[PDB]
């Protein structure tokens, strides 16, 4: 299952609660809310909610994406297998197959300090 | 992207290997060949080779035409969403709608029990 430990920790590689109701723009693309969502990732998770900015600005309907997004894409990207969080956090960061690029690998790292605790300051 | 696993798994379903050469009515229609293709979808993919049956009765020539609906029709049945390979499984089954039809279900299941190994 992609559980809350692993979206927690998403959440917070993205910046969570300090990007509600903010965007942003990253590679030409505006991005918003506690888990940095483009539009073609809300079309992709099947566009929760009023819109996409009042969407994925919101933290609540941004959870409700993310989580369609894992169940439509996991087992696409990793070609049968049961997926882990390493996969769903690369699939968060890469797209559909975020999971088996090398691109995702520093972003996964990010999230598994959270999820495991390491160099944990206060 | 549409995958090897995901079109070995489709002609795993419709017979594959076995129905090389052959053609025979499926559900009120002629289909033909490793991944018992009709001929509206040989119009839709682009009428690849030099003929339905003659094309649709040969793996690489089948091959070539669902490659060309997938890519052709996946986004389309998806409404822009990046398709799966429950996507492209459940249009090569059900048409360009497949995608959200029903009656395309059953043909899914037993895709993924190919892809999961249970089965
Ligand atoms: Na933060
Ligand atoms: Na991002
Ligand atoms: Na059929």
Same mark, same amino acid.
């Given at each position: 299952?992609? @559980?809350?430990? +692993? %979206?927690? +920790?998403? +959440?917070?590689?993205?910046? +969570?609660?300090?990007?509600?109701?903010? !965007?942003?723009?990253? #590679?030409?693309? %505006?991005?918003?809310?506690?888990?940095?969502?483009?539009?073609?990732?809300?079309?992709? =998770?099947?566009?929760?909610?009023?819109?996409?900015?009042? =969407? &994925?600005? $919101?933290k609540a309907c941004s959870e409700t994406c #993310? *989580?369609?997004?894992?169940? *439509?894409?996991?087992?696409? !990207?990793?070609?049968? *297998? &049961?997926? &882990?969080?390493?996969?769903?956090?690369?699939?968060? $960061?890469?797209?559909?197959?975020g999971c088996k690029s090398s691109a995702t690998?520093?972003?996964?790292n990010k999230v598994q300090k959270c999820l *495991?605790? @390491?160099?944990?300051?206060?």
């Amino acid at each position: 299952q992609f @559980t809350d430990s +692993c %979206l927690r +920790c998403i +959440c917070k590689v993205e910046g +969570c609660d300090s990007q509600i109701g903010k !965007c942003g723009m990253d #590679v030409g693309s %505006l991005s918003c809310g506690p888990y940095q969502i483009k539009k073609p990732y809300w079309i992709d =998770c099947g566009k929760p909610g009023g819109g996409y900015e009042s =969407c &994925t600005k $919101n933290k609540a309907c941004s959870e409700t994406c #993310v *989580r369609a997004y894992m169940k *439509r894409y996991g087992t696409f !990207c990793t070609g049968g *297998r &049961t997926p &882990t969080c390493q996969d769903y956090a690369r699939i968060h $960061n890469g797209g559909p197959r975020g999971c088996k690029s090398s691109a995702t690998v520093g972003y996964w790292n990010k999230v598994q300090k959270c999820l *495991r605790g @390491t160099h944990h300051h206060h």
